[PDB]
Design a protein around this ligand. Structure first.
Ligand SMILES: Nc1ncnc2c1ncn2[C@@H]1O[C@H](COP(=O)(O)OP(=O)(O)OP(=O)(O)O)[C@@H](O)[C@H]1O
Lengths: 512, 147
């Protein structure tokens, strides 16, 4: 079932039938929706030409997770900004046809003498349907690469506009970008979908949003809804009072009246609008999502005390104020809260909205995190949302030890034909489950042992020992400094003494 | 010079009694000058209240009006929280049981059925509800304060 084949025939059927209701319920629409929901959205390839430090490069992305590792000034943030540029145009076209996106800044072009223009290319694969978008800008070159090729993305935008125009409560892809410091339409909730960029360490705003949402949720539980539950408070009672205690023809006659009352009570529920993610349903779903992300807590609730009000979290047998949390936990709290907020609103039809599709970009995930937190963030992220594609850049070797070797890319700098250009390599071993220093050495190509001055005497003493010159006066003099700095019981000294004894025994045997 | 021995001595008594009493009361002092005409005629969210908040100034002007609005909504939410929870459970049990009796009396249909048992259950629920009341015994002291 190709997307194009279903799309063309549905368009023809829509053109043939003037009546909207005739085509509203038909096999063509069901076929299109069914084949659309099974497709998995994910980017496939990207190419960069004359953008910032990058001269010419092509990158292939995985389907579930991809981690970029490198030093400073190696274009890690360039790749993420390129993808954000590509996705901006698609978002603008989805919102409205023929809408400008984000242009390339003039200062972002390479400063080399012979450069003329900068181009960005991308490929989006949806099951079998494929598309490609190229955006280019020339600073001063006489010849340019014509204009941006937006033909491929307009067909996809029109597909989404068509599907969501006829059938409501549809689904849309998720695009988010958690950047670095730098610096109608479901607006009732106050969440803003217009801005792709979002910033962490804004716990105050999310705290106020949660409080206001809770107040609206509590308000909706009263008034007319309290009347409907009151009716249900008697129909079920009548059912029990007529069929439980008197089991042991006028008695049976009341059962008809009770069933009539139940059917009449069904009239009020019949005259009720769809939930459409009302205030009540959003709150519990968000709270349960956060509880699922962090299983160390029992429950979270807002308590209005005799004079104050605060949010209380319970773990084990201790209750902690929300403000007592450290900076790392606050950052995790707001990151997961924002992700859950977007996912719930974008998928109002699914029973479990945590199974949506989209792409999420995170830059410097290990910011403001203790080493004990860094060793479990990836597993939880990849387990809470199992149908999202992640692109992550990191600096900490502790995170690398929890990532499979098939999702690691290393950026280096090599010179070919007199021109220095970036290059992408892969680790040569398996780095999942290895120690911290093994991961640093293999996944980052750095010396795990410092080159301090105090180390300088250590290798000299070792070398003198290995050359069977440990009895020399120079070795005796150097041992005083080493033993003074480290101490007798340090394991490094212990192994040196073991080597001394082994060599002494070998010399004794050889002498005899 | 000024003579401030009397005020210092009197205020020391109030501070001492406030030290050993959980919720000791304090006298009320206020002044509504002629500038109040546009006080009603014409920031970081507050979460903690105290009786010393009213002692910052002796006069009424400007931001006091704003604080009244922020205090009023705080009272309303406090009532709403107490309107839910276990108080709703007694609401459901007592009303339905009473309705079960009333319809039967109205119905007059036909061991005397289970009317006596239902009345006994209603009496037990009413006794438990009355015993559960604490403080002012009318939804604690939140709904009554707001009303
Ligand atoms: N106009 C330009 N021409 C050439 N090189 C440029 C230009 N502008 C920036 N650069 C290069 O960009 C490099 C830094 O790029 P970038 O910001 O991607 O680095 P990063 O370390 O990955 O970033 P971050 O810390 O934000 O993740 C610098 O080393 C600089 O040489």
């Amino acid at each position: 079932m190709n997307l194009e084949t279903c799309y063309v025939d549905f368009l023809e059927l829509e053109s043939h039938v003037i009546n909207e209701d005739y085509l509203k319920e038909s096999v063509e629409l069901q076929k299109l929706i069914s084949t659309l929901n099974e497709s998995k959205f994910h980017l496939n390839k990207i190419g960069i030409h004359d953008f910032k430090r990058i001269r010419e490069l092509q990158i292939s992305l995985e389907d579930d997770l991809t981690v970029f590792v490198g030093d400073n000034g190696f274009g890690k943030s360039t790749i993420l900004d390129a993808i954000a540029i590509v996705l901006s145009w698609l978002r603008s076209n989805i919102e409205k046809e023929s809408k400008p996106g984000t242009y390339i800044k003039s200062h972002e072009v390479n400063n080399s003498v012979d450069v003329e223009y900068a181009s960005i290319d991308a490929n989006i694969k949806l099951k079998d349907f494929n598309t490609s978008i190229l955006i280019t800008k020339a600073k001063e070159g006489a010849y340019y690469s014509r204009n941006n090729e937006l033909l491929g993305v307009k067909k996809l935008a029109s597909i989404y506009r068509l599907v969501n125009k006829y059938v409501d409560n549809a689904s849309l892809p998720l695009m988010a970008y958690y950047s670095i410091a730098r610096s109608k339409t479901v607006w009732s909730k106050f969440d803003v979908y217009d801005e792709i960029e979002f910033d962490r360490n804004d716990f105050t705003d999310f705290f106020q949003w949660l409080v206001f949402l809770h107040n609206r949720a509590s308000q909706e539980k009263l008034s007319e809804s309290q009347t409907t539950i009151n009716a249900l408070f008697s129909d079920i009672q009548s059912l029990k009072a007529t069929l439980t205690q008197l089991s042991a023809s006028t008695v049976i006659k009341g059962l008809e009246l009770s069933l009539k009352e139940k059917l009449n009570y069904m009239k009020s529920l019949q005259s009720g609008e769809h939930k459409f993610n009302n205030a009540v349903s959003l709150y519990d779903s968000v709270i349960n999502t956060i509880l699922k992300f962090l299983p160390e807590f029992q429950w979270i609730k807002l308590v209005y005390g005799d004079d104050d009000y605060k949010i209380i979290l319970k773990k084990g047998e201790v209750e902690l104020d929300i403000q007592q949390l450290s900076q790392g936990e606050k950052t995790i709290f707001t990151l997961v809260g924002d992700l859950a907020r977007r996912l719930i609103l974008l998928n109002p039809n699914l029973s479990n909205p945590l199974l949506g599709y989209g792409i999420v970009l995170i830059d410097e995930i290990d910011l403001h995190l203790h080493p004990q937190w860094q060793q479990t963030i990836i597993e939880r992220l990849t387990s809470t949302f199992p149908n999202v594609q992640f692109v992550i850049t990191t600096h900490s070797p502790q995170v690398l030890s929890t990532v499979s070797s098939r999702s690691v890319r290393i950026l280096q700098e090599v010179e070919v034909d007199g021109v220095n250009d970036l290059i992408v390599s892969h680790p040569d071993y398996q780095i999942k489950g290895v120690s911290n220093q093994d991961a640093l050495l293999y996944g980052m190509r750095t010396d795990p042992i410092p080159s301090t001055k105090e180390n300088g005497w250590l290798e000299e003493y070792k070398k003198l020992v290995e050359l069977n010159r440990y009895s020399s006066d120079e070795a005796l003099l150097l041992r005083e400094k080493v033993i003074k700095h480290f101490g007798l019981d340090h394991p490094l000294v212990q192994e040196c003494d073991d080597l001394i004894s082994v060599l002494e025994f070998k010399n004794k045997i050889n002498q005899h | 010079n000024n003579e401030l021995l009397g005020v210092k001595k009197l205020a020391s008594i109030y501070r001492l009694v406030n030290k050993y009493v959980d919720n000791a009361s304090l006298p009320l002092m206020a002044y509504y000058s002629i500038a109040r005409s546009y006080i009603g005629g014409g920031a970081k969210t507050k979460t903690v209240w105290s009786k010393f908040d009213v002692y910052d100034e002796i006069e009424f002007d400007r931001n006091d009006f704003t604080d009244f609005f922020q205090w009023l909504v705080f009272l309303h939410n406090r009532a709403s929280q107490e309107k839910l929870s276990e108080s709703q459970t007694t609401i459901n049990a007592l009303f339905s049981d009473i309705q079960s009796l009333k319809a039967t009396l109205t119905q007059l249909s036909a061991d005397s059925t289970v009317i006596k048992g239902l009345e006994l259950s209603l009496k037990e629920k009413l006794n438990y509800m009355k015993s559960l009341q604490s403080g002012e015994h009318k939804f604690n002291n939140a709904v009554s304060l707001y009303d």
